[PDB]
Design a protein around this nucleic acid. Structure first.
Ligand SMILES: [Zn+2]
Lengths: 49, 48, 147, 49, 1091, 98
RNA sequence: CCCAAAAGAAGUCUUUCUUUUGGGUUUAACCAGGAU
DNA sequence: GAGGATAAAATACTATATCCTGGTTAAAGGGTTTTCT
DNA sequence: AGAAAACCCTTTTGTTATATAGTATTTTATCCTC
């Protein structure tokens, strides 16, 4: 819901996520940029990290 | 001059349409007030 | 029925209860995130949030007084309507009816406008930030540098 | 968008006349207008992709 | 030419122009003095509109008065607006921050309708801003200009659209009034002629017609010729007339108890009262023209009428029927056709007068509401006009307009041409016009009706392209606001000199020829066939017997800026545009020089722009000095002209003026007597003539770059002066005691050395960054804060002027201050890498490398070229014009002599006399669209005088043989060389460079600020985090978003690690994320960070 | 979880908030529409900037003035009721209107 | 984290150490004008 | 003739590159209070 | 004792919107069926 909220239709995404009580597992590249953590791609993956 | 030796610096131009819009060079001091750019990368940046 | 079933199932599965839709208390954002700037000469510019909170508090106090002092049902109902409109304007200004305008006939930035468009804290203060150790300048061409 | 049946008959070395220059600016301006609007549009497509 | 003391600038022109260029600022000056009603406008309207001369204020007052109560027992009226002398002159008002205005008085009469007691008084209506004689207002000390606006004229507009579902044409009509309520009659699928009174839901017209008092018999009697009307009549469901009014009420104003009286009153008040439906005077004329109702009666009345409504319904139904012409009873026939909303017969021009009139109108409306209310809450026989008038709203409205609007703009004073072009601007965006982000591609084009009324070349290049334009040279605005152009009329194929001004419609009706046609010296065309412009902008060949009009002269389509480009007809429109948008950004150089090859338009632009001093009356000069000039008129009187020496302009460029007359010369009225910022003897001079070669050189001039010789730095050929202004105010404050004192608390003796006794830097001290300019201390609420104004980051240069205003000297200071010390700092900037030189035709570039004067390609005799341009930029962009200019430039510099030993050569047969020979450094002019042909240039180049010895450096082709200064050998092939006139644009490097290691941070979120002023840090935007992701680099992105922007402990820890050589620490989390969490929680969303 | 913050993030979970949670977050109740008094240029009481609700405006300085030294830490003011702590707490505490 | 002022000590003829007080957002939002 | 079902129209919401600098930032009215004459 | 200039509070006809393009959900209108 974090990525979708940051993409478009912020109000609708937030309200429906709030209703459904969705829990966002932190995986992707936009949310890890938002919360200031290493992206899980490129040099950031476990094998090279 | 002894500090910047072999210390990469990122150059960027806006808009950064594609991946090659950001490139890391090595800096060298010049006289004046204008960043000097290599002529063979003008196509990558799309910079006149 | 199918279009409806989504929300009913959503409220059925989880332990959360629908009563959250109707509010009984209204939270207030910490002051530092809605500061007033006292420009020189007593020019204290106030964030729109301050004005909207002021309206809500005024109306709440008035309605509380009118209920305590005793009044006919009609006046109390109208005051409750005004409170409802004030809160609606606080959460999303301009969604229903005429926007609550301030100086020089302009809309006021309610909370929901801080999380929307290319001015909210989602695509202008979280995905791209200004940074230190930086500069800019005009570029020229030098056919003496290597690649 | 339809062609003017005149048509222009002078080369830029010899120099256009008044009317020919006018009917040239006619189509010259839309080029800049479309350039601006398309460079505006392309960013939206890149973002969605 | 006709200016008494202009320089002798010879021209190649072949044609002769019957009509002299009108006053280039006449539009503004003659559109304002209409507002106040000066005698000059009265005289002008006498020889034209003598039927009804009335000024704007007079019109507003007459429309307003009388003001009467409901009972009608008393009335208040106004009349005879009157103006007194200005409070202070222009210079004093500009210097002391006093708005330039004059008092306004009006005669208010109060009449009691039951006693006959008349009470008259002269009431003061406020301070009305006036206009300096050169077209600019002065407000709060700054100089402001009001721009004209293009709007859709009020009237009836018909338009047809195709239907997707049924593929039927659907016609629709809109009656757009001024300050009224619309009503549209439209047809649709399922043919049904309806109404849209106001902007409510649809309903059959029969409802409206019956509501107006039409029986079911009358409608079919008159509207009995179309199936649509009969069908609508059959399906109306409206009985009698009252039900119609009640139904109209149910839509106009929902949720009310319908009643006949209120419904009738509201319906009448919406349209048939001169209170909420005003077609103005232009609208009524347009409507009467379109429907042909009242061709004879003068336009007196501005409300609709039943005849107009029935006529428009009939017109619409006939148009749907496919008719060709219609006859309305009591009116002449007219053609029935759709209308366009770009034809310059439908877009009108609200000038400066109209806008101020509207603002005064709304102010008076508010005052009228106040007076009406007060008229019933005060006892009679105590009321006097002065006790019912409340002046504050009027002054409030005027000030609101002149201070806050999209049409009252800061004058652009880069140079005189910028101002002259800014006064003649037409902007389609503003209050009541389309918006920058909501304009389609059908309004930005160039409609074929613009010829001679709006320049098609000059226009901004950004997202404004098309919404802003410049008025052409010869255009004028007629009383209604439509733009008119002159045409020379042909009678029986004889070209007379009777000049007739035509608007768009009349030009559409007739046939117009071209200016540069073969006149046979007796007003007769050489050949029968000549290009013409037909009704819809078609270009065709008509025999020379139907032609009705001809252009007064070429150039008629190009604005002032674009008329100064030589060889304009050789350049593509795309580059001529960038050539006309890069003459308004020059910079007044220390010493100016007139161009060698101009276009004869420089003199008029300079004299009209108003930056030069022009002798007001003929006389003989008495004394001349760098400060003032004394003229001894022919009859006793004497006059002294003062000069502006080193005065700052609104954009930071000098505004010098120096005399060009001696102590014994005699001057004539209108003669130029003192140069300006960018003038040289009365001619525009925006740049310098530089020797230019067109060879590519070692790649330094690669991709539009430019190379300069060092001679343009040593000799200050390109050296600008800039001036900066710093202000500081000692506010009174509630605590009080703010004072501009010298002793700076906790300061050293050295840093306090410059400051004078008062505490203001001595004039003549170089205040480089980090010095003090003013010593200011304010209470802490010693208990004080030293807000001692310091030279901001990046400035320098001497201090040339201080100005201190004191409360004790009873000045007009802002409320709650005592002093407003203001300082000026000036600096000379030479040319250097990063500047933005650019010619006229659009060959912009950024100086790439200033080589020393020894290694430059030098001609055979040792002259080094002073600039080098690339060949690869000329042919591709289609601005070949410059090359031609280059050639001509050389011919002007070296001087030529056509050898008429045995008959004139054929190529010079039509060359004018006294142009067969010219001395070196001779100035010439090639008008924009009738100039020097190619054959003439070849002939001139074929013969040119030697320089000093019997050598010619440029052969017939125009290319010389250059020696390479860096290596020694001659270049194998000849190169082009000449003289080109290039300028220095106002995009210098010193205002662009910027860097930041660590500096101020924001408050709400801990990110760094933005902009070169505070300290500023560049923005790592949205799509500069995709490139980093694409590369696969993650650590760099993490550090660019955590320990460089807003991680509060990360910043200090990285700084300490760097200075102490440790390894940089790890990042935390960004503050903006916690701000996001709090904002979400404020909306009653229980966001929690689980683990 | 993780209370204030620091990198143990593993899941964000949004959801509707009930009145009880809203009254849990808040440290007080705002009941007066006064922002700041002009003469003192200090926060009003029970207003939109009250120091007793959102925290002190200056580092380790109570509204009354009974305490202005660091050593005094965590003592809720006995006269003015403002908790003595760092001013940064004004960026975190929330109020609630009833 | 950083700067300013006052006092004490050491050496140099001007830097270091100790104590007290004071402190840091030229912020921010709008409209307008430009550049590529 | 009445009720249900399907097109139609009618409204409601969403989106439409990057960067930089310059000028303003409230007025107006009613009610109340104090000083001067 | 009355008049004039200075505090403290409140609050802001339908305006002017020259929009397109797309989708998604509610009326409502009319047509078909029993
Ligand atoms: Zn306390």
């Amino acid at each position: 819901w974090l990525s979708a909220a940051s993409f478009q239709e912020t109000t609708r995404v937030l309200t429906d996520a709030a209703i459904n009580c969705r829990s966002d597992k932190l995986n992707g590249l936009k949310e890890n940029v938002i919360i200031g953590k290493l992206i899980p791609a490129g040099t950031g993956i476990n094998r090279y990290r | 001059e002894e500090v910047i030796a072999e210390h990469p610096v990122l150059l960027n131009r806006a808009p950064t349409l594609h991946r090659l819009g950001i490139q890391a060079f090595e800096p060298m001091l010049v006289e004046g007030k204008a960043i000097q750019l290599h002529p063979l990368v003008c196509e990558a940046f799309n910079a006149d | 029925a199918l279009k409806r079933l989504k929300v009913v199932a959503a409220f059925q599965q989880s332990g959360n209860s629908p009563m959250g839709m109707v509010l009984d208390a209204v939270p207030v954002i910490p002051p530092e995130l809605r500061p007033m700037v006292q420009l020189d000469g007593g020019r204290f510019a106030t964030s729109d949030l301050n004005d909207l909170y002021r309206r809500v508090i005024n109306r709440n106090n008035r309605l509380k007084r009118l209920i305590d002092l005793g009044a006919p049902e009609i006046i109390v109902n109208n005051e409750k309507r005004m409170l409802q409109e004030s809160v609606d304007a606080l959460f999303d200004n301009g969604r229903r009816g005429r926007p609550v305008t301030g100086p020089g006939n302009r809309p006021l930035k309610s909370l929901s406008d801080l999380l929307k468009g290319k001015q909210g804290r989602f695509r202008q203060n979280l995905l791209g930030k200004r940074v230190d150790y930086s500069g800019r300048s005009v570029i020229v061409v030098g056919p003496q540098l290597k690649l | 968008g339809e062609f003017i049946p005149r048509p222009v008959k002078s080369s830029f070395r010899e120099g256009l006349t008044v009317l020919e220059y006018f009917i040239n600016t006619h189509g010259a301006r839309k080029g800049l207008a479309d350039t601006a609007l398309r460079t505006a549009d392309s960013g939206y497509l890149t973002r969605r992709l | 030419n006709s200016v008494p003391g202009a320089p002798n600038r010879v021209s190649f022109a072949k044609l002769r122009e019957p009509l002299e260029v009108p006053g280039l600022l006449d539009v503004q000056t003659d559109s304002f003095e209409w507002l106040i009603g000066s005698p000059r406008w009265r005289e002008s309207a006498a020889e034209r509109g003598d039927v009804n001369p009335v000024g704007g204020l007079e019109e507003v007052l007459y429309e307003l008065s009388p003001i009467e109560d409901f009972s009608g027992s008393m009335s208040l009226s106004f009349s005879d607006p009157r103006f007194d002398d200005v409070k202070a002159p222009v210079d004093e008002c500009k210097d002391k921050d006093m708005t330039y205005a004059a008092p306004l008085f009006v005669t208010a009469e109060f009449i009691n309708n039951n006693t006959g007691e008349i009470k008259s008084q002269t009431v003061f209506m406020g301070d009305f801003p006036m206009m300096t004689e050169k077209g600019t207002f002065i407000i709060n000390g700054t100089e402001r200009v009001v721009v004209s606006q293009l709007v859709r004229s009020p009237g009836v507009y018909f338009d047809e659209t195709i239907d997707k579902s049924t593929d039927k044409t659907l016609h629709s009509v809109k009656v757009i009034p001024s300050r009224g309520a619309w009503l549209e009659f439209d047809v649709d699928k399922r043919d049904t002629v309806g109404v849209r009174i106001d902007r409510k839901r649809r309903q059959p017209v029969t409802v409206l017609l019956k509501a107006l008092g039409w029986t079911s018999e009358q409608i079919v009697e008159r509207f009995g010729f179309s199936e649509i009307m009969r069908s609508t009549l059959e399906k109306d469901n409206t009985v009698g007339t009252d039900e119609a009014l009640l139904d109209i009420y149910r839509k106009l104003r929902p949720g009310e108890p319908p009643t006949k009286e209120s419904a009738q009153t509201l319906l009448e008040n919406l349209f048939f009262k001169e209170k909420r439906y005003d077609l103005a005077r232009v609208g009524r004329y347009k409507v009467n023209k379109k429907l042909g109702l009242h061709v004879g009666e003068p336009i007196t009345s501005s409300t609709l009428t039943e005849e107009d409504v029935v006529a428009t319904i009939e017109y619409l139904v006939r148009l749907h029927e496919g008719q060709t012409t219609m006859t309305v009873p009591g009116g002449v026939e007219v053609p029935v056709e759709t209308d366009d909303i770009d034809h310059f017969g439908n877009r009108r021009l609200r000038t400066v007068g109209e806008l101020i009139q509207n603002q005064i109108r709304v102010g008076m409306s508010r005052m009228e509401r106040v007076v009406r209310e007060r008229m019933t809450t005060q006892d009679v026989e105590a009321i006097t006009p002065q006790t019912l008038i409340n002046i504050r709203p009027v002054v409030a409205a005027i000030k609101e307009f002149f201070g806050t609007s999209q049409l009252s703009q800061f004058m652009d004073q880069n140079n005189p041409l910028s101002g002259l072009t800014h006064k003649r601007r037409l902007s389609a965006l503003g209050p009541g016009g389309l918006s920058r982000e909501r304009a389609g591609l059908e309004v930005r084009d160039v409609h074929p009706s613009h010829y001679g009324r709006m320049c098609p070349i000059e226009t901004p290049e950004g997202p404004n392209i098309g919404l802003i334009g410049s008025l052409s040279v010869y255009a004028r605005v007629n009383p209604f606001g439509f733009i008119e152009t002159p045409y020379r009329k042909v009678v029986d194929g004889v070209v007379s000199d009777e000049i007739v001004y035509l608007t768009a419609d009349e030009e559409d009706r007739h046939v117009v020829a071209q200016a540069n046609s073969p006149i046979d010296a007796d007003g007769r065309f050489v050949e029968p066939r000549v290009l013409v412009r037909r009704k819809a902008g078609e270009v065709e060949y008509v025999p020379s017997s139907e032609v009705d009009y001809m252009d007064v002269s070429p150039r008629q389509m190009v604005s002032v800026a674009t008329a100064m480009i030589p060889f304009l007809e050789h350049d593509d429109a795309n580059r001529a545009l960038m050539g006309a948008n890069m003459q308004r950004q020059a910079v007044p150089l220390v010493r100016s020089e007139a161009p060698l090859v101009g276009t004869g338009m420089e003199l008029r632009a300079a004299i009209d722009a108003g930056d030069v001093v022009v002798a007001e009356e003929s006389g003989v000069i008495e004394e001349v000095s760098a400060d003032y000039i004394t003229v001894m008129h022919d009859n006793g009187t004497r006059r002294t002209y003062r000069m502006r020496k080193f005065a700052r302009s609104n954009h930071g460029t000098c505004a010098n003026q120096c005399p060009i007359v001696d102590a014994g010369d005699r001057v004539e009225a209108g003669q130029v007597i003192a140069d300006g910022p960018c003038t040289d003897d009365g001619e525009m001079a925006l740049g310098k003539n530089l020797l230019v070669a067109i060879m590519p050189w070692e790649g330094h001039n690669y991709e539009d770059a430019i190379i300069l010789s060092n001679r343009l730095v040593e000799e200050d050929v390109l050296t600008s002066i800039h001036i900066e202004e710093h202000e500081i105010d000692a506010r009174d404050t509630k605590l009080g005691a703010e004072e501009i004192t010298r002793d700076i608390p906790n300061i050293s003796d050295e840093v306090l050395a410059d400051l004078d006794e008062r505490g203001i830097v001595r004039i003549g001290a170089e205040v480089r960054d980090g010095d003090i300019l003013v010593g200011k201390v304010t209470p802490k609420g010693r208990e004080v804060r030293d807000t001692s104004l310091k030279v901001p980051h990046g400035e320098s240069g001497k201090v040339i002027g201080i100005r201190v205003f004191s409360r004790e000297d009873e000045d007009e200071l802002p409320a709650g201050v005592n002093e407003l010390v203001r300082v000026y700092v000036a600096q000379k900037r030479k040319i250097s890498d990063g500047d933005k030189l650019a010619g006229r035709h659009g060959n912009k570039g950024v100086i790439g490398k200033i080589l020393p004067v020894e290694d430059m390609p030098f001609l055979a005799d040792g002259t080094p070229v002073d600039i080098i341009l690339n060949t690869h930029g000329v042919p591709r962009r289609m601005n070949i014009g410059q090359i031609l200019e280059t050639h001509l430039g050389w011919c002007a510099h070296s001087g030529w002599k056509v050898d008429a030993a045995k008959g004139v050569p054929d190529w010079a047969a039509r060359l004018p006399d006294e142009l067969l020979e010219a001395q070196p450094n001779a100035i010439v002019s090639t008008p924009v669209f009738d100039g020097a042909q190619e054959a003439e240039l070849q002939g001139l180049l074929s013969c040119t005088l030697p320089n000093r010895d019997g050598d010619v450096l440029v052969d017939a082709d125009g290319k010389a043989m250059l020696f390479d200064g860096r290596s020694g050998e001659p270049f194998p092939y000849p190169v082009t060389v000449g003289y080109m006139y290039i300028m220095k644009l106002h995009h210098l490097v010193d205002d662009k460079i910027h860097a930041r290691s660590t500096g101020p941070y924001s408050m709400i979120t801990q990110q760094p600020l933005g902009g070169k002023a505070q300290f500023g840090g560049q923005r790592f935007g949205e799509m500069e985090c995709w490139a980093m992701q694409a590369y696969g680099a993650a650590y760099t992105l993490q550090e660019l978003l955590t320990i460089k922007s807003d991680d509060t402990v990360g910043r200090v820890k990285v700084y300490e690690a760097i200075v102490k050589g440790e390894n940089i620490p790890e990042p935390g989390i960004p503050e903006s994320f916690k701000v996001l969490l709090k904002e979400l929680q404020s909306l009653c969303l229980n966001v929690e960070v689980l683990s | 979880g993780a209370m204030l913050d620091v990198n143990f993030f593993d899941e964000l979970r949004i959801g509707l908030a009930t009145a009880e949670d809203i009254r849990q977050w808040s440290y007080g109740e705002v009941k007066k529409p006064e922002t700041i008094n002009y003469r003192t240029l200090k926060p009003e009481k029970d207003g939109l900037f009250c120091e007793k609700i959102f925290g002190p405006t200056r580092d380790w300085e109570c509204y009354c003035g009974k305490y202005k030294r660091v050593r005094f830490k965590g003592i809720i003011c006995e006269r003015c009721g403002v908790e003595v702590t760092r001013a940064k707490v004004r960026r975190e505490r929330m109020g609630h209107i009833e």
